[PDB]
Amino acid sequence: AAMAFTLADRVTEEMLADKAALVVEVVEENYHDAPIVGIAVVNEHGRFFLRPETALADPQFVAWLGDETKKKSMFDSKRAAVALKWKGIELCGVSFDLLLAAYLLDPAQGVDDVRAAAKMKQYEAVRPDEAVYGKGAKRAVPDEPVLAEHLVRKAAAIWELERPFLDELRRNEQDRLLVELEQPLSSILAEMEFAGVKVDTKRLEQMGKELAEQLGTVEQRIYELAGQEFNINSPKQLGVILFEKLQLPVLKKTKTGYSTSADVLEKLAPYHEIVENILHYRQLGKLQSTYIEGLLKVVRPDTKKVHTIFNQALTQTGRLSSTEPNLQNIPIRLEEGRKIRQAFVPSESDWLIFAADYSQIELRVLAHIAEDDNLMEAFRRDLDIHTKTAMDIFQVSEDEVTPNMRRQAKAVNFGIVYGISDYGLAQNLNISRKEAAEFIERYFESFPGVKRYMENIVQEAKQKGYVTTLLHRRRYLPDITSRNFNVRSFAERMAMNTPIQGSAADIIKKAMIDLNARLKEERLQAHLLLQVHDELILEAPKEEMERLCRLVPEVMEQAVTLRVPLKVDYHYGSTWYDAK
DNA sequence: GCATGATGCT
DNA sequence: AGCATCATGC
């Protein structure tokens, strides 16, 4: 039974009411400089569909869009906001975003369209986007009658679902999390994505050139050591040359066939000169394929800029994800990949890259939530946490902790974070489980408060059905009651870890909001470019560096008040590579 | 078209 | 942990 609506030929005053559900449809997944396919407005006066060419050319409609006092409820308003920024139009007054409300209520649902969110409340009078647009190749905008009905039905759902969603968010004590955190953050992310990051493609093209040289050299060497040419990129052909032709030991297998996993080849290293070349070849290869060739594909030729899209409603912990390209995983660990960061430059002459990062925010958050005296005292002293952990679990003085001891205490801290899995520890430390488990027990002896928190949180997750973060983000853990050891075990590790990774996500999001408010009050030209989980990257005139050196760390450190201090380090330079 | 398995980051 | 991407290959 079709839904009633006016298929408008011109904008009317009726369509410019004080409150409305608004749909500004951008069908391309990547909404940067993309077409707006149609518009729908549902308010107390009715339902309307507007062709974009006419409404976006109407001064009253554009003014209504930018009027902060004209409240709009939408689904993924960041997508619309950015598609409109590319058209020189400002979107304001978005007081409710259904995608974000759904995400906060339950991130595991995987809500990615209005139909998915509506189903959460037994509302199914709207179709899934995939159903009307199709998938991949066959994707396509349908004819106006079909298109117009779909947009109006989506707008009507938002109009109807706003109250029940806000009601549940309030019961969950998540209303402010939505209104004061995620929604204001959405607008900040829109500015970042729209601004983009400048790329020195000539540099990138020079690197790919040398990398192509190296690659070819290591690849030929590998054919020598193997005695024949094969597809090094095929773990299949790889596994046969290593474990059959060269008879290397099988220390590990995969579902079917052999495992050429990274650390397996690490173990194999000692036996053959070919293993080191395959690992090096894999390193240069990832650099070439993903970070030179892949990057170059998404750079806009007109501006030499790259515009990521931050998925704000995907992760189970409250973290953001980044795509097309992923700017949260640019190489930094090994020096050869790190050089890729030389290609990321300021978008204006005489401007520089400024990067600030939290120092151990997770362990600091853990010290705070577990209220572990030893852990809190360690951060209050701003101690090297890995040396301090080594001192404690190995029972030696700072003087006697050796590099191998620190590396292992560091391994327990890296693991500790993510629910401290001893099976995974043992593999990381390449030790037996009984030994890994021994490390863990010595940790809990030294950090009793952390032990108690892990126990208490697992009990809570069981009792309530979910765990929450500092700012009330929530994660349901149905598997924590499983009678299957493994399944139940993972959920218990999520119960321990989510409040840690999730609260750190909360903290840095609030810092971003606080920072932009300060940057504006100061009328600084400096602005955010990226966020990579525990660090913020900006660019600004070289003349603003000194003010930034003082402003950025302070805002980040003061975003929330914990039982221990928050510490932020920062650097700046002429390329991302130099902001170190 | 997909998943498998691999590397990259926090 | 759990994100995103890319090459293979069925």
UniProtKB/Swiss-Prot annotation:
It catalyses: DNA(n) + a 2'-deoxyribonucleoside 5'-triphosphate = DNA(n+1) + diphosphate. One of its GO terms (molecular function) is DNA binding. Signal peptide: none annotated. One of its GO terms (biological process) is double-strand break repair. Residues 1-580 are annotated as: Subtilisin large fragment. It is an enzyme of class 2 (transferase). Belongs to the DNA polymerase type-A family. The enzyme from this organism does not have any 3'-5' exonuclease activity. The subtilisin large fragment (residues 289-876) has wild-type polymerase activity but no 5'-3' exonuclease activity. Single-chain monomer with multiple functions. In addition to polymerase activity, the recombinant enzyme has strand displacement and 5'-3' exonuclease activity, but lacks proofreading 3'-5' exonuclease activity. This is DNA polymerase I. It comes from Geobacillus stearothermophilus (Bacillus stearothermophilus). The lineage of its organism: Bacteria, Bacillati, Bacillota, Bacilli, Bacillales. The chain holds residues 297 to 876 of 876 of the full protein.
